[PDB]
């Protein structure tokens, strides 16, 4: 088709590209290098090459693919490691037997050799079918019991032929439609552009909490299925705990990890620990990789790949939301993606906005983050999915004045504020409660009042206790303990118990790996009851020091309350919490005599 | 304490001499292989000159070189600069050279080719011909010596795998 | 120091002898394979391949 | 079968005298036939001198060649350019160790040519992330400030931040001279199955210190493990760009095909950045932040990420970039981007240098992010991590107590502070202070650290585990 002219790194002026569209992927050279059109000028198309361009001759063909940057959506997406361009890193490794990624490699994103068992849906021949309609289910893994086959959006018509129950590959035709005489062939997969969000019937309000299993997150700074969360992606802060808890214990029916622009040896950790993460939510111990897809991009991966990594991940998450599955997307470092944007803008020469970042960085971030959220999926049958984005910002050594960090904090409704110092003191999960916040507290009032009515009140009381201790530690340090009233000592002691017990979750143990929301609520009732009983008893003239030296047994019971094993059953754990509350009330009544 | 400086001096200041001697020996080991390769190349050059000395065997090779040079140039106008000897062979077989060029490349046969009056240095070229485009602006040095130099530069790993087996250290 | 100087003087000759042995082995291998290498090189040089760089 | 090179083919080269213009460091050609983008070409000056050039731009029948060693003497009438048809491939072999190369791959040790096993292409393809594996063992350096407290793993990429005039070049020379593997074994690390190697690359290096590197490596026996890549400050700029690529291609070859453990020291990364900026402005690109082009995070990433250990190969690449901070700030683009891409950093402090401490490594700011993977029971010694932690804690306390020594007085300090002043004294001038030719194994450095820590009492050596403390401190 086309030819080549001026080459300066990835920019490649083409010839005879009369029928090329803007932002259309093309195959450049005899090696079929991937690249997207950046400008059109008559028959000349400015193509930025998505990888190294050292060997390119003038005149050798450039074939236009006809589609923008798109991801192959279908079965086989689970348990696969991809880059930003959704190149299967594993399949590339076995196909080439090579340590590196060969230039111009074109292995299909989804495996075409695997034969999948396909069960057709309710739609029959002659039925009118619309985009998003589930016309079949495919048993992908044990965790994904049925990868429902969606009709691609923007495509509809009358079903003229549908494959019966059987076992199929992706290339084999599965369903056939006729729209207005024109005949279309649909297969087990489809490709959707990454930069247009997958359409939904209605974007609902995200109101069901994202139970990460961490007490601090689930109680004080709760995210929502379909919510948005920001995280400081520093090194020492235990963000691995957060990522592993979301990918291991959360409510999500799917996990998309997007390692955009990460270090070489950090992606090594991410790719090597995930295969041995296991879940019990299925009722049987199975790896989380059966439910998770990784998008892995070391910093040497092409700039286009790093920039498009988050879009590929969010498109996969939208695809799995459109099946009715609550999917959580974790971005390793959105600051690396913003660096990729800055490089792209610089190479295109666009005028900067804020120390080099393009004028659309905020617009791109807002548009990308708006793709998250609970939504009724397009087409029939009626179903509801949710995409939750948990993105980590890692600016230049905590320089949170970065426009990337500023925009992310202005868009994301939840900030979990990991702290370096809390990790130094081995206070995992190391959430800095002073700076962390959550703007989904108001929305989750419905869920709480439906299930745990006292949860918001206890959460606010715990917030007040911790804030009071935080603001009173300065007066302690400045003046001395003697200046403190008895109630202030109560606040300090209860807050220290909170920090040592409720906020601090071992995670690597068996009783603290997953603290359910009901056990968390029981612990909040226990702690708030302790604080209230101490406050009331001391307000009844009792000297707090005598009670502290006397009521250490109930304090120890509260301390061991975190050792209650959630696996013992909700009823059993609730009963033992009731026994704990009865015992603490009785012992306070005795000691206040 | 004072003699601790000279306690290991005989192995620290003589370490420089030992390392220099070892480096010289290692470089000589490689220089021997380089000299052997240079001798092999000199023998190859002598054999190539001898082969070019036989006109009957030279003619098909010379036409092949001319055709390849034209295809690299890829133009209907070309100028060939050959040796003082066998200057008549090119003139005699240009009619077939043009047909061969027009057959090997789908385009039309070369309209005309001119033998340059600037004859190549017989004392150095020892064979081949340097074909040049019209106005002598673009040339291809398809001389036997130039080809030998290019092959020596490029086929060095092949020579390595020929004289010696695969490197036992290179497991890959 | 004197013993080290004498040992270095002798080790220079010892290393020269070892390098001489290695070089003799290399020269023997080169003389063995020279005919084949020269034949391959001459065949490569004297047998060119037509090509066109349209593509 | 290895005999699959198929390199016996002969590729004739076109030479054009059709030079259409000369513009600074680049030459424009008017009638090139199918030019390659990054092709290396040879210019024949009218006086007969031959210069290399790399194609920078290819328009329709027009190629812009950026010429090494300037463009003086080139006329549009007599000069000719020969197109090689291939990019800057370099000859690689198992016996490149002990050779000293120019920044263009040409040997400069008066030795022969490389006698390639293969002409491995420069700036090779990126390592597949699915093939990488986490660094798992310590690469030794012989420097206590690095071995004990900023230990480097076998796949780590850890820079040495420094500034002009500080002895970072001598630190690099010492590391190249004393680096190796840690664990003692029945067979030495000089064998054919557990071997170690070093690739030293100097970019924009001064002639005096280039000669220093050459003489230092050729005399101390480190050359037989080292492939040195010298690039003088007056050498061509494109040569400076290609030098780290040459070094990393050699390191990739050795580690991932010969299965060696390769340490790569890329000294003067700031000079490479200056060269990169010059090349960028040669293509009429508008400079980015601080005059440096905005895309070098990508190029520094391509340089740095050519490291780490991989799944199927027993070899590994460890990189120690060395960059001079201009005006001594981290906010400068070069140290900032290197901190983005690399794991940790080693700091060379001017204040320590002025006190006569060598190496002047300031350990409070220096950090090895994945040090914990290089230290353990089968990895050095079981006490490595907590001894390093205790050294860091007591050194910070000593610095704070030195601040209070002139504010509250010596006698007003606490007993820990009185111990901390003398601990800091002994630390900086006996443990950090290590001779330029003093090779300390990791265990020698560890027990020197213990001898420094034996002054403190049991109660407030609190950052050492009580098991290790009760097994090492009390005798």
From Swiss-Prot, chain C:
Keywords: Acetylation, Hydrogen ion transport, Ion transport, Membrane, Transport, Vacuole
Lineage top rank: taxon: Eukaryota
GO molecular function, one term: proton-transporting ATPase activity, rotational mechanism
GO terms under cellular component: fungal-type vacuole membrane; Golgi membrane; proton-transporting V-type ATPase complex; vacuolar proton-transporting V-type ATPase complex; vacuolar proton-transporting V-type ATPase, V1 domain
Single GO BP term: vacuolar acidification
Function (record text): Subunit of the V1 complex of vacuolar(H+)-ATPase (V-ATPase), a multisubunit enzyme composed of a peripheral complex (V1) that hydrolyzes ATP and a membrane integral complex (V0) that translocates protons. V-ATPase is responsible for acidifying and maintaining the pH of intracellular compartments.
Note: Present with 2280 molecules/cell in log phase SD medium.
Protein name (Swiss-Prot/TrEMBL): V-type proton ATPase subunit G
Organism of origin: Saccharomyces cerevisiae (strain ATCC 204508 / S288c) (Baker's yeast)
Taxonomy of the source species: Eukaryota, Fungi, Dikarya, Ascomycota, Saccharomycotina
Gene (UniProt): VMA10
